[PDB]
């Protein structure tokens, strides 16, 4: 609990699991965005 990186990233193998470490956006998430992102839900796990 007490988690403020709710944020997921999704790559190429599909590690979906938290932003986390720093607390940004490398390339990953941008690529994901890029090729899908559909919305912010396609990161965001809702809550």
């Known amino acids: 609990a007490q988690r403020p ?16 470490g720093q607390g ?10 890029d090729e899908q992102g559909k919305s912010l839900d396609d990161f965001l796990i809702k809550q």
């Open 24 to 33: 940004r956006t490398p390339a990953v998430i941008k690529k994901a965005m």
């Open 5 to 20: 990186a709710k944020y997921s990233y999704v790559d190429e193998n599909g590690e979906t699991k938290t932003w986390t």
